[PDB]
Amino acid sequence: TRGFQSMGMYSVMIQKVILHDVLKFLFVYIVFLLGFGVALASLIGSFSDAVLELFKLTIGLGDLNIQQNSKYPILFLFLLITYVILTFVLLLNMLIALMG
Amino acid sequence: TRGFQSMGMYSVMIQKVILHDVLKFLFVYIVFLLGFGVALASLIGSFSDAVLELFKLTIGLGDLNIQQNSKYPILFLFLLITYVILTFVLLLNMLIALMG
C-alpha cells in the first residue's frame, strides 16, 4: 500500500504503534496474566483452562459464577474483580501514554 | 438537521469522519478479515459461517472453544488470538489517526 499516500501514512503508523507502545502493554499484561493465572490454578480448574478463561474474560466472554474445587468463592470473586479492574486501568494507562 | 447550528456542526462531522478515516480502517479490516477467514475455512466450518463467527467475535459474541474438523486446536486458538490482537491494534491506530 506504499504508493497510496493517504494509505501509506495510515500504514506506517501501524508500524509505529506496534514498535513503540503495544509491546510495553503486552509485557505488563503477560506478567499480570501469569500472576493471576498461577493464583487461580492454585485455587484449583487447570492451568491452561484458567488462563484461557481469563483471556476470554478479557475479550468479553466466559462464565464466572461457581468454579470447581473452590475453598471459598468470595476470594475467587474479588480476585477476579481485582484482575478486571487492573486490566482496565492498565489499558487506560496504555492508551493515554500513546495519546501522550 | 441543518438549520440547527449546534446540531448541524454535529451533523457535518459525521460526513467528515466517514469520508476520511473509517473507510481506510474498513479497507485494512476487510483484507485482514479475508486473510484470516480463508485460513480458518481452510482449517475446516465453512466459509460464510467462519467469517460470520469472526464478525460476531469482533462485535462481542460467539463461542470459540472446539470447532469441528480441527487438525490441532492449539494453532486455531492462537490464530484466533492473533486476529483479535491485530484487530485491537488496528482499531487503536485508527482512533489515534483520527485523533491526530
PDB file of C-alpha atoms in Angstrom:
ATOM      1  CA  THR A   1       0.000   0.000   0.000  1.00  0.00           C
ATOM      2  CA  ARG A   2       3.018   2.312  -0.055  1.00  0.00           C
ATOM      3  CA  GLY A   3       2.422   4.427  -3.121  1.00  0.00           C
ATOM      4  CA  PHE A   4      -1.008   5.452  -1.996  1.00  0.00           C
ATOM      5  CA  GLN A   5      -0.006   8.430   0.147  1.00  0.00           C
ATOM      6  CA  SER A   6      -3.276   8.717   2.085  1.00  0.00           C
ATOM      7  CA  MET A   7      -2.988   4.985   2.812  1.00  0.00           C
ATOM      8  CA  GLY A   8       0.794   4.835   3.247  1.00  0.00           C
ATOM      9  CA  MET A   9       0.659   7.383   6.043  1.00  0.00           C
ATOM     10  CA  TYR A  10      -2.015   5.151   7.559  1.00  0.00           C
ATOM     11  CA  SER A  11       0.286   2.164   7.056  1.00  0.00           C
ATOM     12  CA  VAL A  12       3.457   3.446   8.713  1.00  0.00           C
ATOM     13  CA  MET A  13       1.531   4.482  11.837  1.00  0.00           C
ATOM     14  CA  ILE A  14       0.691   0.788  12.347  1.00  0.00           C
ATOM     15  CA  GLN A  15       4.428   0.065  12.439  1.00  0.00           C
ATOM     16  CA  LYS A  16       4.970   2.983  14.835  1.00  0.00           C
ATOM     17  CA  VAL A  17       2.250   1.759  17.214  1.00  0.00           C
ATOM     18  CA  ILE A  18       3.361  -1.908  17.402  1.00  0.00           C
ATOM     19  CA  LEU A  19       7.039  -0.960  17.705  1.00  0.00           C
ATOM     20  CA  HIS A  20       6.582   1.565  20.493  1.00  0.00           C
ATOM     21  CA  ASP A  21       3.658   1.142  22.866  1.00  0.00           C
ATOM     22  CA  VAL A  22       1.660  -2.090  22.447  1.00  0.00           C
ATOM     23  CA  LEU A  23       4.739  -4.200  23.271  1.00  0.00           C
ATOM     24  CA  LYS A  24       5.079  -2.491  26.658  1.00  0.00           C
ATOM     25  CA  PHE A  25       1.385  -3.114  27.343  1.00  0.00           C
ATOM     26  CA  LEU A  26       1.833  -6.763  26.389  1.00  0.00           C
ATOM     27  CA  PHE A  27       4.934  -7.009  28.595  1.00  0.00           C
ATOM     28  CA  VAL A  28       2.992  -5.792  31.627  1.00  0.00           C
ATOM     29  CA  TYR A  29      -0.155  -7.749  30.694  1.00  0.00           C
ATOM     30  CA  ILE A  30       1.693 -11.087  30.437  1.00  0.00           C
ATOM     31  CA  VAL A  31       3.131 -10.801  33.948  1.00  0.00           C
ATOM     32  CA  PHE A  32      -0.265  -9.760  35.345  1.00  0.00           C
ATOM     33  CA  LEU A  33      -1.815 -12.674  33.432  1.00  0.00           C
ATOM     34  CA  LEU A  34       0.674 -15.158  34.900  1.00  0.00           C
ATOM     35  CA  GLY A  35       0.395 -13.673  38.394  1.00  0.00           C
ATOM     36  CA  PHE A  36      -3.348 -14.170  38.332  1.00  0.00           C
ATOM     37  CA  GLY A  37      -3.353 -17.450  36.391  1.00  0.00           C
ATOM     38  CA  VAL A  38      -0.978 -19.317  38.683  1.00  0.00           C
ATOM     39  CA  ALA A  39      -3.063 -17.984  41.593  1.00  0.00           C
ATOM     40  CA  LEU A  40      -6.357 -19.219  40.146  1.00  0.00           C
ATOM     41  CA  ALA A  41      -4.834 -22.563  39.123  1.00  0.00           C
ATOM     42  CA  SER A  42      -3.510 -22.928  42.667  1.00  0.00           C
ATOM     43  CA  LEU A  43      -7.087 -22.396  43.805  1.00  0.00           C
ATOM     44  CA  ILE A  44      -7.957 -25.403  41.523  1.00  0.00           C
ATOM     45  CA  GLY A  45      -9.649 -25.648  37.059  1.00  0.00           C
ATOM     46  CA  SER A  46      -6.290 -26.489  35.487  1.00  0.00           C
ATOM     47  CA  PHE A  47      -3.616 -24.034  34.321  1.00  0.00           C
ATOM     48  CA  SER A  48      -4.235 -23.734  30.577  1.00  0.00           C
ATOM     49  CA  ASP A  49      -8.008 -23.754  31.064  1.00  0.00           C
ATOM     50  CA  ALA A  50      -7.967 -20.958  33.655  1.00  0.00           C
ATOM     51  CA  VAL A  51      -5.667 -18.741  31.595  1.00  0.00           C
ATOM     52  CA  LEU A  52      -7.903 -19.315  28.548  1.00  0.00           C
ATOM     53  CA  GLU A  53     -10.945 -18.393  30.650  1.00  0.00           C
ATOM     54  CA  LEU A  54      -9.072 -15.283  31.804  1.00  0.00           C
ATOM     55  CA  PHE A  55      -8.356 -14.244  28.210  1.00  0.00           C
ATOM     56  CA  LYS A  56     -11.989 -14.929  27.275  1.00  0.00           C
ATOM     57  CA  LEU A  57     -12.992 -12.694  30.183  1.00  0.00           C
ATOM     58  CA  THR A  58     -10.689 -10.022  28.763  1.00  0.00           C
ATOM     59  CA  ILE A  59     -12.121 -10.109  25.226  1.00  0.00           C
ATOM     60  CA  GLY A  60     -15.691 -10.258  26.541  1.00  0.00           C
ATOM     61  CA  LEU A  61     -16.924 -13.809  27.172  1.00  0.00           C
ATOM     62  CA  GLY A  62     -16.699 -16.588  29.734  1.00  0.00           C
ATOM     63  CA  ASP A  63     -18.926 -17.556  32.661  1.00  0.00           C
ATOM     64  CA  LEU A  64     -17.620 -16.792  36.118  1.00  0.00           C
ATOM     65  CA  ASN A  65     -20.050 -17.895  38.838  1.00  0.00           C
ATOM     66  CA  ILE A  66     -19.082 -21.153  40.638  1.00  0.00           C
ATOM     67  CA  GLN A  67     -15.902 -22.938  39.586  1.00  0.00           C
ATOM     68  CA  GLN A  68     -14.935 -26.406  40.759  1.00  0.00           C
ATOM     69  CA  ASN A  69     -12.955 -27.142  43.963  1.00  0.00           C
ATOM     70  CA  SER A  70     -13.095 -23.615  45.343  1.00  0.00           C
ATOM     71  CA  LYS A  71     -12.357 -23.349  49.049  1.00  0.00           C
ATOM     72  CA  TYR A  72     -14.268 -20.074  49.308  1.00  0.00           C
ATOM     73  CA  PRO A  73     -15.735 -18.392  46.199  1.00  0.00           C
ATOM     74  CA  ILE A  74     -15.726 -14.910  47.783  1.00  0.00           C
ATOM     75  CA  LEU A  75     -11.944 -14.700  47.432  1.00  0.00           C
ATOM     76  CA  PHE A  76     -12.117 -16.132  43.897  1.00  0.00           C
ATOM     77  CA  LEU A  77     -14.761 -13.496  43.128  1.00  0.00           C
ATOM     78  CA  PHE A  78     -12.863 -10.445  44.303  1.00  0.00           C
ATOM     79  CA  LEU A  79      -9.585 -11.796  42.888  1.00  0.00           C
ATOM     80  CA  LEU A  80     -11.361 -11.908  39.523  1.00  0.00           C
ATOM     81  CA  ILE A  81     -12.738  -8.381  40.039  1.00  0.00           C
ATOM     82  CA  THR A  82      -9.246  -7.158  41.031  1.00  0.00           C
ATOM     83  CA  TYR A  83      -7.861  -8.677  37.811  1.00  0.00           C
ATOM     84  CA  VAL A  84     -10.554  -6.994  35.699  1.00  0.00           C
ATOM     85  CA  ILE A  85     -10.074  -3.547  37.255  1.00  0.00           C
ATOM     86  CA  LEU A  86      -6.280  -3.891  36.967  1.00  0.00           C
ATOM     87  CA  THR A  87      -6.595  -4.791  33.279  1.00  0.00           C
ATOM     88  CA  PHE A  88      -8.899  -1.776  32.828  1.00  0.00           C
ATOM     89  CA  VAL A  89      -6.509   0.692  34.482  1.00  0.00           C
ATOM     90  CA  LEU A  90      -3.605  -0.848  32.523  1.00  0.00           C
ATOM     91  CA  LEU A  91      -5.492  -0.366  29.237  1.00  0.00           C
ATOM     92  CA  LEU A  92      -6.331   3.219  30.224  1.00  0.00           C
ATOM     93  CA  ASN A  93      -2.694   3.966  31.114  1.00  0.00           C
ATOM     94  CA  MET A  94      -1.523   2.471  27.803  1.00  0.00           C
ATOM     95  CA  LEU A  95      -3.994   4.484  25.728  1.00  0.00           C
ATOM     96  CA  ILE A  96      -3.131   7.762  27.451  1.00  0.00           C
ATOM     97  CA  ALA A  97       0.600   7.091  27.073  1.00  0.00           C
ATOM     98  CA  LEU A  98       0.186   6.548  23.329  1.00  0.00           C
ATOM     99  CA  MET A  99      -2.004   9.634  23.325  1.00  0.00           C
ATOM    100  CA  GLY A 100       0.838  11.463  25.067  1.00  0.00           C
TER     101      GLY A 100
ATOM    102  CA  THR B   1     -30.962  18.979  10.811  1.00  0.00           C
ATOM    103  CA  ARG B   2     -29.053  21.729   9.008  1.00  0.00           C
ATOM    104  CA  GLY B   3     -30.587  24.886  10.388  1.00  0.00           C
ATOM    105  CA  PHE B   4     -29.974  23.870  13.948  1.00  0.00           C
ATOM    106  CA  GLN B   5     -26.418  25.177  14.278  1.00  0.00           C
ATOM    107  CA  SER B   6     -25.491  23.191  17.398  1.00  0.00           C
ATOM    108  CA  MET B   7     -26.787  20.083  15.611  1.00  0.00           C
ATOM    109  CA  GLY B   8     -25.583  20.963  12.105  1.00  0.00           C
ATOM    110  CA  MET B   9     -22.000  21.199  13.303  1.00  0.00           C
ATOM    111  CA  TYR B  10     -22.594  17.776  14.841  1.00  0.00           C
ATOM    112  CA  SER B  11     -24.006  16.598  11.511  1.00  0.00           C
ATOM    113  CA  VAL B  12     -21.204  17.636   9.163  1.00  0.00           C
ATOM    114  CA  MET B  13     -18.587  15.965  11.376  1.00  0.00           C
ATOM    115  CA  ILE B  14     -20.318  12.638  10.632  1.00  0.00           C
ATOM    116  CA  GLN B  15     -19.704  13.276   6.929  1.00  0.00           C
ATOM    117  CA  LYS B  16     -16.088  14.241   7.657  1.00  0.00           C
ATOM    118  CA  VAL B  17     -15.459  11.055   9.659  1.00  0.00           C
ATOM    119  CA  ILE B  18     -16.958   8.578   7.142  1.00  0.00           C
ATOM    120  CA  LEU B  19     -15.311  10.320   4.182  1.00  0.00           C
ATOM    121  CA  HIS B  20     -11.825  10.436   5.663  1.00  0.00           C
ATOM    122  CA  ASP B  21     -10.832   7.782   8.181  1.00  0.00           C
ATOM    123  CA  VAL B  22     -13.360   4.959   8.670  1.00  0.00           C
ATOM    124  CA  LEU B  23     -13.042   3.921   5.006  1.00  0.00           C
ATOM    125  CA  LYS B  24      -9.300   3.345   5.431  1.00  0.00           C
ATOM    126  CA  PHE B  25      -9.976   1.267   8.551  1.00  0.00           C
ATOM    127  CA  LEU B  26     -12.560  -0.753   6.634  1.00  0.00           C
ATOM    128  CA  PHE B  27     -10.130  -1.195   3.729  1.00  0.00           C
ATOM    129  CA  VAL B  28      -7.497  -2.683   6.030  1.00  0.00           C
ATOM    130  CA  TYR B  29     -10.058  -4.637   8.087  1.00  0.00           C
ATOM    131  CA  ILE B  30     -11.566  -6.370   5.029  1.00  0.00           C
ATOM    132  CA  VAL B  31      -8.201  -7.717   3.871  1.00  0.00           C
ATOM    133  CA  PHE B  32      -7.350  -8.869   7.409  1.00  0.00           C
ATOM    134  CA  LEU B  33     -10.820 -10.442   7.607  1.00  0.00           C
ATOM    135  CA  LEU B  34     -10.316 -12.326   4.334  1.00  0.00           C
ATOM    136  CA  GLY B  35      -6.759 -13.335   5.232  1.00  0.00           C
ATOM    137  CA  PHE B  36      -7.989 -14.903   8.441  1.00  0.00           C
ATOM    138  CA  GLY B  37     -11.295 -16.224   7.079  1.00  0.00           C
ATOM    139  CA  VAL B  38      -9.823 -18.163   4.171  1.00  0.00           C
ATOM    140  CA  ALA B  39      -7.265 -19.541   6.649  1.00  0.00           C
ATOM    141  CA  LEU B  40      -9.901 -20.707   9.130  1.00  0.00           C
ATOM    142  CA  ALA B  41     -12.116 -22.107   6.359  1.00  0.00           C
ATOM    143  CA  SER B  42      -9.094 -23.997   5.038  1.00  0.00           C
ATOM    144  CA  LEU B  43      -8.767 -25.436   8.530  1.00  0.00           C
ATOM    145  CA  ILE B  44     -12.419 -26.643   8.065  1.00  0.00           C
ATOM    146  CA  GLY B  45     -16.600 -24.795   9.461  1.00  0.00           C
ATOM    147  CA  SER B  46     -17.498 -23.406   6.037  1.00  0.00           C
ATOM    148  CA  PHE B  47     -16.503 -20.020   4.596  1.00  0.00           C
ATOM    149  CA  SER B  48     -19.548 -17.829   5.244  1.00  0.00           C
ATOM    150  CA  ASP B  49     -20.088 -19.369   8.681  1.00  0.00           C
ATOM    151  CA  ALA B  50     -16.499 -18.771   9.818  1.00  0.00           C
ATOM    152  CA  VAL B  51     -16.448 -15.168   8.609  1.00  0.00           C
ATOM    153  CA  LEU B  52     -19.782 -14.567  10.382  1.00  0.00           C
ATOM    154  CA  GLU B  53     -18.331 -16.098  13.556  1.00  0.00           C
ATOM    155  CA  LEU B  54     -15.299 -13.832  13.136  1.00  0.00           C
ATOM    156  CA  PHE B  55     -17.506 -10.740  12.872  1.00  0.00           C
ATOM    157  CA  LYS B  56     -19.520 -11.904  15.895  1.00  0.00           C
ATOM    158  CA  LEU B  57     -16.222 -12.253  17.756  1.00  0.00           C
ATOM    159  CA  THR B  58     -15.412  -8.679  16.739  1.00  0.00           C
ATOM    160  CA  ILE B  59     -18.691  -7.166  17.972  1.00  0.00           C
ATOM    161  CA  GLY B  60     -18.574  -9.213  21.180  1.00  0.00           C
ATOM    162  CA  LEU B  61     -20.227 -12.633  20.853  1.00  0.00           C
ATOM    163  CA  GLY B  62     -19.544 -16.116  19.534  1.00  0.00           C
ATOM    164  CA  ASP B  63     -18.213 -19.267  21.197  1.00  0.00           C
ATOM    165  CA  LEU B  64     -14.674 -20.270  20.356  1.00  0.00           C
ATOM    166  CA  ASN B  65     -13.634 -23.469  22.147  1.00  0.00           C
ATOM    167  CA  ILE B  66     -13.641 -26.622  19.944  1.00  0.00           C
ATOM    168  CA  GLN B  67     -14.654 -26.297  16.301  1.00  0.00           C
ATOM    169  CA  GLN B  68     -15.281 -29.243  14.008  1.00  0.00           C
ATOM    170  CA  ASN B  69     -12.571 -30.998  11.933  1.00  0.00           C
ATOM    171  CA  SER B  70      -9.628 -29.214  13.522  1.00  0.00           C
ATOM    172  CA  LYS B  71      -6.288 -30.922  12.998  1.00  0.00           C
ATOM    173  CA  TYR B  72      -4.826 -29.259  16.086  1.00  0.00           C
ATOM    174  CA  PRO B  73      -6.837 -26.686  18.084  1.00  0.00           C
ATOM    175  CA  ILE B  74      -3.716 -25.005  19.520  1.00  0.00           C
ATOM    176  CA  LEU B  75      -2.963 -23.401  16.156  1.00  0.00           C
ATOM    177  CA  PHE B  76      -6.638 -22.476  15.689  1.00  0.00           C
ATOM    178  CA  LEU B  77      -6.530 -20.936  19.174  1.00  0.00           C
ATOM    179  CA  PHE B  78      -3.504 -18.717  18.708  1.00  0.00           C
ATOM    180  CA  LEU B  79      -4.562 -17.825  15.149  1.00  0.00           C
ATOM    181  CA  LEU B  80      -7.799 -16.543  16.689  1.00  0.00           C
ATOM    182  CA  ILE B  81      -5.864 -14.665  19.397  1.00  0.00           C
ATOM    183  CA  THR B  82      -3.557 -13.180  16.725  1.00  0.00           C
ATOM    184  CA  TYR B  83      -6.638 -11.989  14.806  1.00  0.00           C
ATOM    185  CA  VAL B  84      -8.136 -10.397  17.930  1.00  0.00           C
ATOM    186  CA  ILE B  85      -4.942  -8.571  18.924  1.00  0.00           C
ATOM    187  CA  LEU B  86      -4.424  -7.414  15.320  1.00  0.00           C
ATOM    188  CA  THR B  87      -7.980  -6.050  15.200  1.00  0.00           C
ATOM    189  CA  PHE B  88      -7.331  -4.300  18.533  1.00  0.00           C
ATOM    190  CA  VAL B  89      -4.099  -2.631  17.384  1.00  0.00           C
ATOM    191  CA  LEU B  90      -5.791  -1.688  14.084  1.00  0.00           C
ATOM    192  CA  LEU B  91      -8.679  -0.045  15.969  1.00  0.00           C
ATOM    193  CA  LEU B  92      -6.198   1.778  18.216  1.00  0.00           C
ATOM    194  CA  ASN B  93      -4.188   3.017  15.216  1.00  0.00           C
ATOM    195  CA  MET B  94      -7.383   4.208  13.500  1.00  0.00           C
ATOM    196  CA  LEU B  95      -8.624   6.097  16.557  1.00  0.00           C
ATOM    197  CA  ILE B  96      -5.286   7.826  17.134  1.00  0.00           C
ATOM    198  CA  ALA B  97      -5.032   8.774  13.453  1.00  0.00           C
ATOM    199  CA  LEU B  98      -8.468  10.402  13.570  1.00  0.00           C
ATOM    200  CA  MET B  99      -7.389  11.984  16.833  1.00  0.00           C
ATOM    201  CA  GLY B 100      -4.312  13.272  15.010  1.00  0.00           C
TER     202      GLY B 100
END
